[PDB]
Design a protein around this ligand. Structure first.
Ligand SMILES: [Mg+2]
Ligand SMILES: [Mg+2]
Ligand SMILES: [Mg+2]
Ligand SMILES: [Mg+2]
Ligand SMILES: [Mg+2]
Ligand SMILES: [Mg+2]
Ligand SMILES: [Mg+2]
Ligand SMILES: [Mg+2]
Ligand SMILES: [Mg+2]
Ligand SMILES: [Mg+2]
Ligand SMILES: [Mg+2]
Ligand SMILES: [Mg+2]
Ligand SMILES: [Mg+2]
Ligand SMILES: [Mg+2]
Ligand SMILES: [Mg+2]
Ligand SMILES: [Mg+2]
Ligand SMILES: [Mg+2]
Ligand SMILES: [Mg+2]
Ligand SMILES: [Mg+2]
Ligand SMILES: [Mg+2]
Ligand SMILES: [Mg+2]
Ligand SMILES: [Mg+2]
Ligand SMILES: [Mg+2]
Ligand SMILES: [Mg+2]
Ligand SMILES: [Mg+2]
Ligand SMILES: [Mg+2]
Ligand SMILES: [Mg+2]
Ligand SMILES: [Mg+2]
Ligand SMILES: [Mg+2]
Ligand SMILES: [Mg+2]
Ligand SMILES: [Mg+2]
Lengths: 394, 15, 60, 153, 57
RNA sequence: UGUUCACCCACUAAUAGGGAACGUGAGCUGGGUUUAGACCGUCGUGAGACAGGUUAGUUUUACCCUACUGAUGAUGUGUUGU
RNA sequence: GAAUGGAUGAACGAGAUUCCCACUGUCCCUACCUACUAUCCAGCGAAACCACAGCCAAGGGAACGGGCUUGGCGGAAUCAG
RNA sequence: CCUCUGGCAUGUUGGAACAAUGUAGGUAAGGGAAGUCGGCAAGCCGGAUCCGUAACUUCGGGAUAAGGAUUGGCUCUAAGG
RNA sequence: UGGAGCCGCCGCAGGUGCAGAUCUUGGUGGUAGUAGCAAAUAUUCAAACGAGAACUUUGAAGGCCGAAGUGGAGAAGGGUU
């Protein structure tokens, strides 16, 4: 018979085999469409979720009940130190698909990077690319290198650049820079490929790729939650108190007769650590990192035109389970998938963004710097110190 | 031999 | 080596628990040739086996 | 006695067995296959590692419910265990053999374990008490073992 | 505190098995079994409720 | 109301109808039917009867195969990694 | 419907109801924590059950098939569920 | 509940982890039975002192009805042989 | 292989041929190295003996039973414990 009292189904099938991701680093599953007209540029970048905080701002959507009212608003910080382009890589279109074609690498590649070509650097003799970089210092090779490029200049349709992170600069424990292919969408294939050839062994910082007040798409792997029961996994109803074998279950699996159980029925398995592609995370700010001229310029980070203090985004006592974000960073509105220290793939949108909300320009009045390791009440040490006075440890 | 049921249980009762 | 005999006998000779019995763990061999009592009585006078004190339980 | 399988050159091969030993046949079997073919000075090292859990034994046949371990990767199998009794039992059987080679006058440290066979021995028996006054059997499943080493260097 | 045991196999409290404490020379409270309390003879006259005098009860 | 059914309140965009061993008891519950105790009424000379009312009344087993969910792996690609 | 007892009735009741107050995770609507388990390992080590076995759709068929027909299709060895 | 006399080695094993399901305990914002057949389960209540106690009643009860108040620590006073 | 008896023909005789009987007795698999060895808070350090110690004994520490006892004694029952 039918179901007496309807309800929607729990979960969405369009996300499943609810399995532990194969990857750790979030793949850009689809870059946006190149055109011609608009200059070459990368389409994406690679970051590290440090943590979160408030922001205060005036808000200018006329019509609202919040119009030119300040609000507080959540943000993530994503520690995003400049990438290095090491290789390029051409893709040819085919009726099968999009076959990879011709991969050049640079002369020099950092150890940061070369780590990733070994499971075990301690043990390894560190011999990768030794016999390759020979090419870059003779005639014969250097000619073949040009032919390898000029082939791509004729044939290949799509050219992405390979880059890697500068793992060095992050507080994180690992030394193995994540590599990545990042797509160059811009002018003709030659022009494209020439731009990449100029960028080889070279830095590419965040600002070059993304701009402020820009909707981007975060991709990254979810915070992982082990095996779980159907209840926390699928958010099916808990059964009632009296229930002789378990109540954090799904009473009936299937009906009798299609007498298998279906993929559509809620079972217990891996919760979290899925691969996920969020979209539309605005960029409330892109901070310049630390640097010097005579003394430090730490001020420039969490400072605003309405605060003008000397704060870093680094809250008191560091970002928790992370460290000091010394480098440049992007400050997305809201949460992003995945956990502290996670390698987080930012990407330009696939989408023509033309909505009131998605074009609003941001002007922050205040970035909250208060400790995250307890109910913090002081923005910065200087302030705390004055408030309390001197102590017994003096 | 294994218990299965009480003699007033008479499992599959369908009076 | 194995002494439960000698902890019993001690106890009944002191007329105490066996909790209260204490055997000098160094001088064990000498104790393990106390297959009788009276043998033990010797060992009590020589100070190998000894009656412990009562575990205090003050009223203060 | 008659061993199963005579060695090709008895002259320079040594023997050792032990009938009706109270070790898990199934654990013993498998580790005895693991051991097979090694140089004796390797196998004594292996079985030491097993006893300490520094190398597993792949459970291949009798592998049901038997968990996974990385250490089994070496072998190229997902199941694996550390059957400490078994090891200790055929660490003796290697010792007796090594001895038998030494008495026959073979270069001990050229031996290779050419044939090693576990076998079901006649079961001991005792019982267990169950619910509703039933009584079930509780059987030890011991194993005859035997093996033949050989000079090969 | 020194508790104690029945000196005889009669485990039950009963009219038989009645006791008292004695300390001893050896200094241990031991149980002694008592005798039953016998009564002085009653009058033959019947009417009188008193038991007789000068008669070891 | 044990109910299916029905009815009524309230909100709603709408409060459409149906199937899957009258989906679904090693998923539950067990309120109802449907043992045994007992109560009433009617029937029966009586033992007893009653799709007439009432109250009390043990809901067993998965460690197999499969199916499903997750999890190791497998064949190839010389070996390995990207 | 009148000792096949009729009508009552304080007190009592692990008795059958109904309602109100308080109370609460019964519920919205689920979460966290503890201990024993399950899990993995060393040692030990049963049982029920078992024609053969073990992916489906439809068909026909003792009128609801794992086996038959016709299609879909099929990839060792396993783990927790 | 904690202890002394006396007795024991955690009840037929150990180790490592701390996932799901369980078994046994807890806690829960706001709401407060909407849950369910049904408040099942748990929760409230609770000890003593001082007040203060209804209908009804076989005048015995109902009654700890109901309903309120107080309680620690310390330093004194007074009263009782 | 084994180590002491056996057969062809003609007649006579029968307790004369097994896949099943939820058949009888015995033995053996799969299940499975699985289910399990989770009621009552608790173990640790050293030393001895010893081929060998998570468990034996000795000492120390931490714990429990907490005099309606996990203490000391008997009845019935056991029958050398
Ligand atoms: Mg419907
Ligand atoms: Mg139940
Ligand atoms: Mg925090
Ligand atoms: Mg299991
Ligand atoms: Mg049992
Ligand atoms: Mg019995
Ligand atoms: Mg007498
Ligand atoms: Mg006289
Ligand atoms: Mg039905
Ligand atoms: Mg079912
Ligand atoms: Mg059932
Ligand atoms: Mg019922
Ligand atoms: Mg009945
Ligand atoms: Mg009548
Ligand atoms: Mg009548
Ligand atoms: Mg069938
Ligand atoms: Mg315990
Ligand atoms: Mg123990
Ligand atoms: Mg016991
Ligand atoms: Mg609440
Ligand atoms: Mg209701
Ligand atoms: Mg309802
Ligand atoms: Mg209750
Ligand atoms: Mg009342
Ligand atoms: Mg003979
Ligand atoms: Mg005959
Ligand atoms: Mg037969
Ligand atoms: Mg197991
Ligand atoms: Mg207690
Ligand atoms: Mg005694
Ligand atoms: Mg006793």
């Amino acid at each position: 018979s039918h179901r007496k009292f309807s309800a929607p189904r729990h979960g969405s099938l369009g996300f499943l085999p609810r399995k532990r991701s194969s990857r750790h680093r979030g793949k850009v599953k689809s870059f946006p469409k190149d055109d011609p007209s608009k200059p070459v540029h990368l389409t994406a970048f690679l970051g590290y979720k440090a943590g979160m905080t408030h922001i205060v701002r005036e808000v200018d959507r006329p019509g609202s009940k919040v119009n030119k009212k300040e609000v507080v608003e959540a943000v993530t910080i994503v520690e995003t130190p400049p990438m290095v382009v090491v290789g390029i890589v051409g893709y040819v279109e085919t009726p099968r698909g999009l076959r990879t074609f011709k991969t050049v690498f640079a002369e020099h590649i950092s150890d940061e990077c070369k780590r990733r070509f070994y499971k075990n650097w301690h043990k390894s003799k560190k011999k990768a690319f030794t016999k390759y970089c020979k090419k870059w210092q003779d005639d014969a090779g250097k000619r073949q290198l040009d032919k390898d490029f000029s082939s791509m200049k004729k044939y290949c349709q799509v050219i992405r650049v390979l880059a890697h992170t500068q793992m060095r600069l992050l507080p994180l424990r690992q030394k193995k820079a994540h590599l990545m292919e990042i797509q160059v969408n811009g002018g003709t294939v030659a022009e494209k490929l020439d731009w990449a050839r100029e960028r080889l062994e070279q830095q590419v910082p965040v600002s070059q790729v993304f701009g402020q007040d820009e909707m981007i798409d975060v991709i990254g792997v979810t915070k992982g939650k082990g095996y779980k029961g159907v209840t926390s996994r699928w958010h099916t109803k808990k059964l009632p108190r009296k229930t002789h074998r378990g109540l954090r279950k799904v009473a009936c699996i299937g009906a009798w007769h299609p007498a298998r159980v279906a993929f559509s029925v809620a079972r217990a398995g891996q919760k979290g650590y899925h691969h996920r592609t969020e979209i539309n995370k605005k960029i409330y700010k892109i901070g310049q990192g630390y640097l010097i001229k005579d003394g430090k310029l730490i001020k420039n980070n969490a400072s605003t035109d309405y605060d003008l203090s000397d704060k870093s985004i680094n809250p008191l006592g560091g970002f928790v389970h992370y460290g000091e974000v010394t480098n440049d960073f992007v400050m997305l509105k809201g949460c992003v998938v995945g956990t502290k220290k996670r390698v987080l793939t930012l990407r330009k949108s696939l989408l023509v963004q033309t909505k009131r909300r998605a074009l609003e320009k941001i002007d922050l009045k205040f970035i909250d710097t208060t400790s995250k390791f307890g109910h913090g009440r002081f923005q910065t040490v200087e302030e705390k110190k004055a408030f309390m006075g001197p102590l017994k440890k003096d | 031999g294994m218990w299965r049921f009480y003699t007033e249980d008479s499992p599959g009762l369908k009076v | 080596s194995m002494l439960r005999l000698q902890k019993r006998l001690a106890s009944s000779v002191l007329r105490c628990g066996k909790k209260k019995v204490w055997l000098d763990p160094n001088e064990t061999n000498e104790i393990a040739n106390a297959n009788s009592r009276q043998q033990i009585r010797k060992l009590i006078k020589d100070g190998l086996i000894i009656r412990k004190p009562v575990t205090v339980h003050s009223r203060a | 006695v008659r061993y199963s399988l005579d060695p090709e050159n008895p002259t320079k091969s040594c023997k050792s067995r032990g009938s009706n030993l109270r070790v898990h046949f199934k654990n013993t079997r498998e580790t005895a296959q693991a051991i097979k073919g090694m140089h004796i000075r390797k196998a004594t090292k292996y079985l030491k590692d097993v006893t300490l859990q520094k190398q597993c034994v792949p459970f291949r046949r009798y592998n049901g419910g038997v968990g996974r371990c990385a250490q089994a990767k070496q072998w190229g199998w997902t199941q694996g265990r550390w059957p400490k009794k078994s090891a200790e039992f055929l660490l003796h059987m290697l010792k007796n053999a090594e001895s038998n080679a030494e008495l026959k006058g073979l270069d001990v440290d050229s031996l290779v374990i050419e044939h090693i066979q576990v076998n079901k021995a006649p079961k001991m028996r005792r019982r267990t008490y169950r619910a509703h006054g039933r009584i079930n059997p509780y059987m030890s499943s011991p194993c005859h073992i035997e093996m033949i080493l050989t000079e090969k260097e | 505190v020194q508790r104690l045991t029945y000196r005889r196999r009669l485990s039950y409290n009963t009219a038989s098995n009645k006791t008292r404490l004695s300390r001893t020379p050896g200094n241990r409270i031991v149980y002694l079994y008592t005798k039953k309390v016998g009564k002085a003879p009653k009058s033959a006259c019947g009417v009188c409720p008193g038991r007789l005098r000068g008669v070891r009860a």
